[PDB]
């Protein structure tokens, strides 16, 4: 039985690879050689956010493009007003092992992660004068690594036990569980229409899942190391992943192929965060070499360097309108780039 | 001054938040943070028995001191990706049982030494000391006569006594340190008495804190 299953899987894998190779005749390397050159983008730190006493691991940008939440391992969760550098809220946390956080696209609820294998969704807009825990959602056997709000009630949570799940606030139970990852998942991204989502795992693969169907639909491969970052294209038919092999690869949900690889023979540092621009032309990614680099999305040529971090950068968020870029490093500082 | 009535109160609220966060961080810095780690079926419960989800925190108070241990035996995941949270800890407590030189899980002591020289010689741990605990001394006493140490280590060329075997184990465990110029390894033999087990922890931390302060100030 084992031999038959292995032979069938190998034969089908070759057929899938042959089908993929049958839809690749003109690579994007030669396609985008006829375009006006893009000048260097010089980004300056417009605003600096201070107040954190520990390393920052995740952050999310609000829909208003003015409120952002930063997750730090000092036991506090801070809502930042980027326009005037003001702390709207300072949420106390029972644990100081934060690894991820999320901001609902409503302004009422805020999520958080940790090493307790539990969800940390709080409520901000309440009759009381303090932020209280709305619901403690447990049921995961793996460390929190990523979480993102879809609706005001639905949320997709990524855990360290090589699986993902969809939770409900009132019930507190996994409505749908995503299983099939051979390795632990670390990050996920949400499509603009909030219908499909793709997550990156340590198994050097990123797989596309459907929230309504609750099963893996499309599988993407080509990376040489574990994937630590992922983000959808603004159009919604493509995405990019940041792995540890110092290369950024962009995968499109339509062609089921890798378009091009962002490589440079100067840095052997992995990518922690990946974000796009408003038009999907800038793909700046936060590397481990104490700074961030901006990569062109069509020519694979660097067109700007973001420096000024005293430690490795692990946070990178872009506003909904694509007007400001916020980076967060391990030096307990946040910088806004315009 | 280009600030409205609401902004004058928003900045005041931000200032109160900043002062509260600073006070909380100052209070948290006083407490001593320790990490508990060990191999398969390691005797990590001895410390919490003497003094008293994926991570559980145990805390207890001495005369003008505070401690907070962290246990990650429930993680069961890739250690290289959640170990970032444990940087800057005062010390790492490693629990190893001497009653493993003949038990087979490949020998258990081989796995314990692999874990020890993987965690000790790590990118993220080059400034934090490691405290080593040796458990089950009585069973080692009663089993050293039945079986010798040569079962585990083929290079042993000494008498099958207790002092020589203990010294050999200690130097074998301390020989895995390739960063002796920055990290020290404390080795103690755990006893039945609760005080004899944690007085060593107190003596270790009261020196590790001093060494870290001197190194940060530039005097060491």
């Amino acid at each position: 039985e084992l031999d038959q299953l292995r032979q069938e899987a190998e034969q089908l894998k070759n057929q899938i690879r042959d089908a993929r190779k049958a839809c690749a005749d003109a690579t994007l390397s030669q396609i985008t050689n006829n375009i006006d050159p893009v000048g260097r983008i010089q980004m300056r730190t417009r605003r600096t956010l201070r107040g954190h006493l520990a390393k920052i691991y995740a952050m999310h940008w609000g829909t208003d493009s003015r409120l952002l939440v930063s997750a730090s391992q000092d036991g506090k969760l801070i809502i930042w007003d980027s326009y005037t550098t003001n702390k709207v809220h300072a949420i106390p946390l029972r644990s100081s092992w934060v690894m991820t956080c999320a901001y609902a696209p409503s302004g009422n609820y805020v999520a958080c992660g940790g090493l307790d294998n539990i969800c940390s969704i709080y409520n901000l807009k309440t009759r009381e004068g303090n932020v209280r825990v709305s619901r403690e959602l447990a049921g995961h056997t793996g460390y929190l690594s990523c979480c993102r709000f879809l609706d005001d009630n639905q949320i997709v949570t990524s855990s360290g036990d090589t699986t993902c799940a969809l939770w409900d606030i009132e019930t507190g139970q996994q409505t749908t569980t995503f299983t099939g990852h051979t390795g632990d998942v670390m990050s996920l991204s949400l499509a603009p229409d909030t219908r499909l989502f793709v997550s990156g795992a340590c198994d050097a693969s990123a797989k596309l899942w459907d929230v309504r169907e609750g099963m893996c639909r499309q599988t993407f491969t080509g990376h040489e190391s574990d994937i630590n970052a992922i983000c959808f294209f603004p159009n919604g038919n493509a995405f990019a992943t940041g792995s540890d092999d110092a290369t950024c690869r962009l995968f499109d949900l339509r062609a089921d192929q890798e378009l091009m690889t962002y490589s440079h023979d100067n840095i052997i540092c992995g990518i922690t965060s990946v974000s796009f621009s408003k038009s999907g032309r800038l793909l700046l990614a936060g590397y481990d070499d104490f700074n961030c680099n901006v990569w062109d999305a069509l020519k694979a040529d660097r067109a700007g360097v973001l420096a000024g971090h005293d430690n490795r950068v692990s946070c990178l968020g872009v506003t909904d309108d694509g007007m400001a870029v916020a980076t967060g490093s391990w030096d307990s500082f946040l910088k806004i780039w315009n | 001054c280009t600030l409205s009535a609401e902004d004058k109160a928003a900045v005041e609220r931000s200032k109160m938040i900043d002062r509260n966060l600073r006070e909380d961080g100052e209070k948290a810095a006083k407490e001593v943070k320790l990490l508990l780690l060990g191999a398969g079926e390691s005797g990590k419960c001895t410390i919490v028995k003497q003094m008293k989800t994926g991570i559980v925190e145990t805390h207890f108070t001495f005369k003008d001191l505070y401690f907070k241990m962290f246990d990650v035996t429930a993680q069961r995941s890739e250690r290289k990706k959640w170990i970032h949270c444990f940087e800057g800890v005062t010390a790492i407590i490693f629990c190893v049982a001497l009653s493993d030189y003949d038990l087979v899980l490949m020998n258990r002591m081989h796995a314990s030494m692999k874990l020890f020289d993987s965690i000790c010689n790590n990118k993220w741990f080059t400034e934090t000391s490691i405290i080593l605990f040796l458990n089950k001394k009585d069973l080692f006493e009663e089993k050293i006569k039945r079986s010798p140490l040569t079962i585990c280590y083929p290079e042993y060329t000494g008498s099958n006594t207790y002092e020589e075997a203990a010294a050999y184990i200690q130097c074998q465990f301390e020989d895995l340190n390739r960063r002796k110029d920055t990290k020290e390894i404390y080795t103690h033999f755990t006893c039945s008495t609760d005080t004899k087990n944690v007085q060593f922890v107190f003596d270790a931390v009261t020196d590790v804190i001093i060494k870290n302060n001197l190194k940060e100030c530039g005097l060491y």
Partner: single-chain antibody, 234 residues
Amino acid sequence: DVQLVESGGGLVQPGGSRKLSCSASGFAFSSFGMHWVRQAPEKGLEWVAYISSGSGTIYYADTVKGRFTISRDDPKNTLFLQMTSLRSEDTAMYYCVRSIYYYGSSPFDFWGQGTTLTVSSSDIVMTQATSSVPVTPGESVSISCRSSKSLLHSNGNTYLYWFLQRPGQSPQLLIYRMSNLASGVPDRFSGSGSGTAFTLTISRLEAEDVGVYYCMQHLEYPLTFGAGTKLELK
């Protein structure tokens, strides 16, 4: 369980001292600004004093400056308005008002039940065109009050507030910042403005939208209120 009970009041001779309390419960008394808005026995509202969270900034009105002391007890969740040299002017209805200030906050959201005190015998001015409008159930009401100065600020938002004081009750906030509906406000209420002229519209009021309408501004210390927009059931 949020409430603001006020203790103290009655008949006091002129030239004395009276003790007031605002013992609060149901919410955290450590991050809400405290107000002491006073309503005259006949009509009209005015701001007396305000203390921020943590007793940082303390503000006083011109008519009560030098004789009013305001303090709060954070552990006991109690607010005090001890006064000296009482005068027949200080014969009105005293209200204890909570408020919070941040990006997206709703100040003056809750008002106390009020206490009655009786004594034996460059500020922005808000003007209302009318004080009595004959209105029937299921009709459109246009309430407008003007401001002497331009309430528009450089940040791009307007600082205008609206209130509804039902008879035998306490004032209730309706619209804050001239474009945001308060909590519990129905879809019928709305608001509009241009910096100088502000309008308030009510559509299909059946029986609950009867009372005195108050509008104020949040731009300086005095915090002057409106006059009155009493509506008659005809």
